[PDB]
Amino acid sequence: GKAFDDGAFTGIREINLSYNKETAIGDFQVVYDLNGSPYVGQNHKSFITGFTPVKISLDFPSEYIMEVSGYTGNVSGYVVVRSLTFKTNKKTYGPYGVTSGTPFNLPIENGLIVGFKGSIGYWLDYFSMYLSL
Amino acid sequence: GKAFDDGAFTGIREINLSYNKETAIGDFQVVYDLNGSPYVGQNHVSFITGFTPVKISLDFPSEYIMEVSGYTGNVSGYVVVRSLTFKTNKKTYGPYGVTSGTPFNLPIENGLIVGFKGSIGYWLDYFSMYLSL
Amino acid sequence: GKAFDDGAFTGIREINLSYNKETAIGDFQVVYDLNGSPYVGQNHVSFITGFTPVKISLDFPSEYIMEVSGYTGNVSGYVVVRSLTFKTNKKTYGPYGVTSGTPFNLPIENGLIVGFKGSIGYWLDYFSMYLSL
Amino acid sequence: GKAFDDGAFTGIREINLSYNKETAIGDFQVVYDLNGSPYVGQNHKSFITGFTPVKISLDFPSEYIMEVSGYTGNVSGYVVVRSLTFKTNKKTYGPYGVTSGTPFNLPIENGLIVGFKGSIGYWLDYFSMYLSL
Amino acid sequence: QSGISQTVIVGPWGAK
Amino acid sequence: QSGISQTVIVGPWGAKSA
Amino acid sequence: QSGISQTVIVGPWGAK
Amino acid sequence: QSGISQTVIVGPWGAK
Ligand SMILES: CO[C@H]1O[C@H](CO)[C@@H](O)[C@H](O)[C@@H]1O
Ligand SMILES: CO[C@H]1O[C@H](CO)[C@@H](O)[C@H](O)[C@@H]1O
Ligand SMILES: CO[C@H]1O[C@H](CO)[C@@H](O)[C@H](O)[C@@H]1O
Ligand SMILES: CO[C@H]1O[C@H](CO)[C@@H](O)[C@H](O)[C@@H]1O
């Protein structure tokens, strides 16, 4: 698919993603904090449609992600991210998508998620996260 | 179990762990690098015996861990780390233990594991990792 | 004067400042790099005029500041930054302003300047720098 | 002179240096903190004698260095560090040595000094500092 | 705030 | 080095590209 | 802590 | 990259 790399910022304000309970995660877009002001990251969209939109608005800066988890698996012969769950110090958002396949989870004891990168074709093929103090 | 926290160092030179093919991981000790000099971390031992020891000697500094993975599962009613696998830029060490339960994995695109903390009773209850550039 | 804080970014692409060789530094504005794209920082302007403009265009990312030096001292009753010199891995820009007073210098062996903060009234009262790997 | 590099640690607990009222700084040695335990750094000694020793015992971890300043100048044909002053969040230690020549100062708004490197012959030729969050 | 250096820490994995 | 700041990056999860 | 990233800051130089 | 951790280093002050 089409690779993307948002880079690192100073925090996360909002996350917008879409999914399909029969396939995987589709679109992914984040509104970051850039030194106290909102910064709208590019919208990384799937090549197809039919996904259910989801908006995660965090109460920045008191609320922040403490754990990201989800599932990866095969869909149409491709290994992709099928589900995502975001747990903050105030609430748990998700799971969004199909909770089937191989789970993964990244609990953060000290530090913050400040950026995302990955690739999206029909679905989110893979993603990585920038971490900072 | 008994908690431990090695803290953070400059890198990793060797990992000494023990495991049992039917239960989980037992002893855990790391020889870190401290500004170019080997630094022997305290040996965190299981309360019991019968484990098979393994010594992972890395070709520091050219060789370093790029991914840590494993499984967590129930053993005698306790949720513990049942298996561990260390993948460096040169080889794959493991899996050591039993690959049953819930998998977890931490791939690193940029950065280094520079320390460990956790808890060990009969087996490795849990563990966390210090990351740095 | 009026305080300002640009925050932290990915790097520095251009520095635009003005000075008066017989008094001190006046205006200060930076064009930062924000994950591969230029980010125009706010123009921090002196309350008075009569300054000589200077544009420092760096060959980002191969060229970067390795040392910042200058002089502080009185202009009337106010202690301000009278002069600044920027030394990169390719050239030396400056000195700009009064090269007399109390010198200061910040050589960087490892790391990068990724942001500026300070205060400007008639002249640059003081400034600090964000450093990162 | 003889170069030295202590590397980076978790913090600073004690600094021992010596100076001569007519020349410059001589010996330099630091007791660092290494993950909660004192770690005695190598004593970097001058080739000659006749210095006055000074012990700076910090109330770690509540007390930490916020600014290092001093003077560099020519002594018998060599440019060396003639004086040093350490300011913590609790008090000022120094100046020690000769306050003449070219001043320098490193105030820290955010971060910590976690290591030292440099060179010492008859006197302290030069030094750099490791900084971290 | 403190005189102790900090580092990013991820985990724990295992018992909660 | 280069004039580009760096930070720790964990992943990727999903398709193995590394 | 908070949800805002931290960075080393040196300075200031100039007026107190 | 190597397996050796890095930190910001400022200086040196004194002789060149
Ligand atoms: C049918 O193909 C598309 O979608 C998959 C999964 O997203 C990608 O791996 C692939 O390269 C294409 O972009
Ligand atoms: C039988 O108990 C011991 O071993 C388990 C697993 O290691 C620990 O959780 C527990 O606290 C004890 O130390
Ligand atoms: C005459 O006053 C102004 O300029 C000086 C120097 O810049 C500032 O310190 C001060 O607050 C005012 O803004
Ligand atoms: C007389 O020389 C010595 O002392 C000076 C100053 O310390 C060093 O620069 C030099 O290399 C020698 O070690």
Side-chain angles (χ1 to χ4, degrees), chain A, chain B, chain C, chain D, chain E residues 2-16, chain F residues 2-18, chain G residues 2-16, chain H residues 2-16:
Chain A
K2 186 181 178 182
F4 71 92
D5 188 348
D6 288 347
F9 297 78
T10 43
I12 308 294
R13 285 170 176 270
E14 178 185 298
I15 297 173
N16 295 295
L17 61 71
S18 66
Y19 66 98
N20 186 311
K21 293 181 288 61
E22 294 224 291
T23 53
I25 289 173
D27 311 298
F28 193 76
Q29 188 275 162
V30 180
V31 176
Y32 300 91
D33 177 72
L34 178 59
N35 302 131
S37 294
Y39 183 95
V40 182
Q42 296 185 185
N43 181 32
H44 309 295
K45 313 185 83 305
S46 161
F47 296 158
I48 61 178
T49 65
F51 298 101
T52 300
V54 182
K55 174 185 296 302
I56 301 173
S57 300
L58 304 182
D59 187 16
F60 181 79
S62 60
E63 173 176 33
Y64 56 82
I65 305 302
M66 291 181 82
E67 172 171 36
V68 175
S69 62
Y71 285 81
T72 61
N74 285 61
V75 177
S76 178
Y78 302 95
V79 179
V80 300
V81 181
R82 307 198 67 183
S83 183
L84 281 175
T85 296
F86 297 98
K87 180 177 180 178
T88 69
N89 57 323
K90 292 190 174 183
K91 182 186 175 184
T92 294
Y93 304 80
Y96 298 119
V98 194
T99 57
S100 177
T102 304
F104 74 83
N105 77 125
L106 176 72
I108 301 179
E109 196 171 304
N110 190 51
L112 299 167
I113 298 169
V114 297
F116 292 93
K117 58 177 293 181
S119 184
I120 300 178
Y122 270 28
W123 307 290
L124 179 63
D125 294 284
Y126 64 79
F127 79 109
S128 294
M129 298 178 270
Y130 288 76
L131 302 184
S132 178
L133 288 176
Chain B
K2 179 175 173 56
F4 71 87
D5 186 350
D6 290 346
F9 296 80
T10 318
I12 298 177
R13 285 166 176 270
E14 173 180 301
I15 299 181
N16 293 297
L17 61 79
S18 73
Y19 68 97
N20 183 295
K21 284 192 63 181
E22 301 184 63
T23 55
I25 292 150
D27 313 309
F28 191 76
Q29 178 189 54
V30 182
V31 177
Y32 301 95
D33 175 67
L34 177 57
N35 302 127
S37 170
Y39 184 92
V40 182
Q42 172 185 52
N43 184 19
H44 309 298
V45 298
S46 161
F47 299 157
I48 62 178
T49 58
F51 296 101
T52 296
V54 178
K55 174 182 294 297
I56 295 75
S57 301
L58 306 180
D59 181 28
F60 179 84
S62 61
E63 176 177 25
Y64 55 94
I65 301 173
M66 290 184 80
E67 180 175 4
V68 174
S69 58
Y71 284 76
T72 61
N74 185 74
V75 176
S76 298
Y78 297 99
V79 177
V80 298
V81 176
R82 303 198 66 183
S83 181
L84 283 174
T85 296
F86 296 88
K87 178 181 176 302
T88 68
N89 56 316
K90 294 186 176 176
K91 303 172 62 294
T92 295
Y93 304 84
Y96 302 112
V98 183
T99 57
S100 175
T102 306
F104 71 83
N105 75 299
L106 179 78
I108 308 302
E109 284 201 23
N110 193 219
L112 302 165
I113 298 170
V114 294
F116 289 95
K117 61 182 292 188
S119 175
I120 298 179
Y122 272 22
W123 307 289
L124 178 58
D125 299 306
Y126 58 77
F127 80 108
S128 296
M129 295 178 272
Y130 288 74
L131 304 183
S132 181
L133 286 175
Chain C
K2 184 180 179 182
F4 70 87
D5 185 356
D6 289 347
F9 298 79
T10 314
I12 307 298
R13 284 169 178 272
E14 177 177 297
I15 294 180
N16 290 291
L17 61 77
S18 70
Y19 70 102
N20 182 311
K21 67 189 91 302
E22 291 311 305
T23 53
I25 293 170
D27 311 313
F28 191 77
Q29 185 272 323
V30 182
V31 173
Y32 299 92
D33 175 68
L34 178 60
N35 302 130
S37 298
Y39 182 93
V40 180
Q42 177 181 300
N43 192 185
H44 307 301
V45 298
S46 159
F47 296 142
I48 60 178
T49 55
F51 297 102
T52 299
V54 177
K55 178 186 294 298
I56 300 175
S57 295
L58 305 179
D59 183 10
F60 182 79
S62 70
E63 173 177 30
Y64 56 86
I65 298 171
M66 299 187 304
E67 176 172 16
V68 179
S69 61
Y71 286 85
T72 61
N74 288 285
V75 172
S76 284
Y78 303 95
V79 174
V80 299
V81 180
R82 293 177 178 171
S83 177
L84 280 173
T85 294
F86 294 99
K87 181 177 180 178
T88 67
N89 57 319
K90 297 189 175 183
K91 314 172 188 175
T92 294
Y93 303 83
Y96 303 113
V98 181
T99 54
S100 185
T102 303
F104 75 80
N105 74 125
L106 176 70
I108 307 297
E109 286 200 18
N110 193 47
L112 299 166
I113 301 292
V114 296
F116 290 96
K117 62 179 289 185
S119 175
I120 298 175
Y122 273 26
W123 307 288
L124 178 59
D125 296 307
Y126 60 76
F127 77 113
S128 300
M129 295 178 271
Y130 288 76
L131 299 185
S132 178
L133 284 176
Chain D
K2 193 182 197 306
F4 70 88
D5 188 347
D6 290 346
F9 294 80
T10 314
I12 300 177
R13 289 170 173 269
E14 173 185 295
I15 297 175
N16 294 283
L17 61 75
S18 71
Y19 68 94
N20 183 96
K21 70 177 182 181
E22 302 181 306
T23 53
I25 291 163
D27 314 301
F28 191 76
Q29 184 241 54
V30 186
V31 172
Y32 297 94
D33 177 68
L34 177 65
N35 302 129
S37 296
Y39 190 96
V40 186
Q42 305 296 300
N43 185 21
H44 309 300
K45 301 185 67 68
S46 159
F47 298 161
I48 61 173
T49 59
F51 296 99
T52 298
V54 178
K55 178 185 292 296
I56 302 302
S57 184
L58 306 179
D59 182 27
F60 180 81
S62 68
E63 175 178 25
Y64 54 94
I65 304 304
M66 299 190 306
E67 179 171 11
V68 180
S69 62
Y71 286 80
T72 60
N74 190 296
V75 175
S76 297
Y78 302 98
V79 177
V80 297
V81 177
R82 307 198 69 182
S83 182
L84 284 173
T85 300
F86 296 91
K87 175 180 176 180
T88 68
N89 56 321
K90 291 187 176 183
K91 70 246 293 184
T92 292
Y93 299 91
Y96 300 112
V98 183
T99 54
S100 186
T102 305
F104 73 82
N105 77 304
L106 179 75
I108 306 302
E109 285 198 23
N110 194 225
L112 301 162
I113 292 166
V114 298
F116 291 94
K117 59 182 293 191
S119 173
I120 297 177
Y122 274 16
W123 306 290
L124 177 62
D125 304 305
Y126 61 78
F127 82 111
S128 300
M129 296 176 278
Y130 289 74
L131 300 180
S132 181
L133 291 173
Chain E
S2 176
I4 305 172
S5 173
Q6 42 180 164
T7 314
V8 163
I9 301 179
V10 291
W13 284 279
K16 181 58 175 295
Chain F
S2 66
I4 305 171
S5 170
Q6 55 176 168
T7 99
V8 168
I9 301 175
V10 291
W13 281 280
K16 181 163 54 184
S17 297
Chain G
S2 63
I4 303 182
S5 181
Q6 289 191 59
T7 300
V8 168
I9 301 175
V10 291
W13 283 278
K16 61 175 64 178
Chain H
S2 62
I4 305 174
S5 174
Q6 291 194 300
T7 86
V8 167
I9 299 174
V10 293
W13 282 278
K16 174 59 188 303

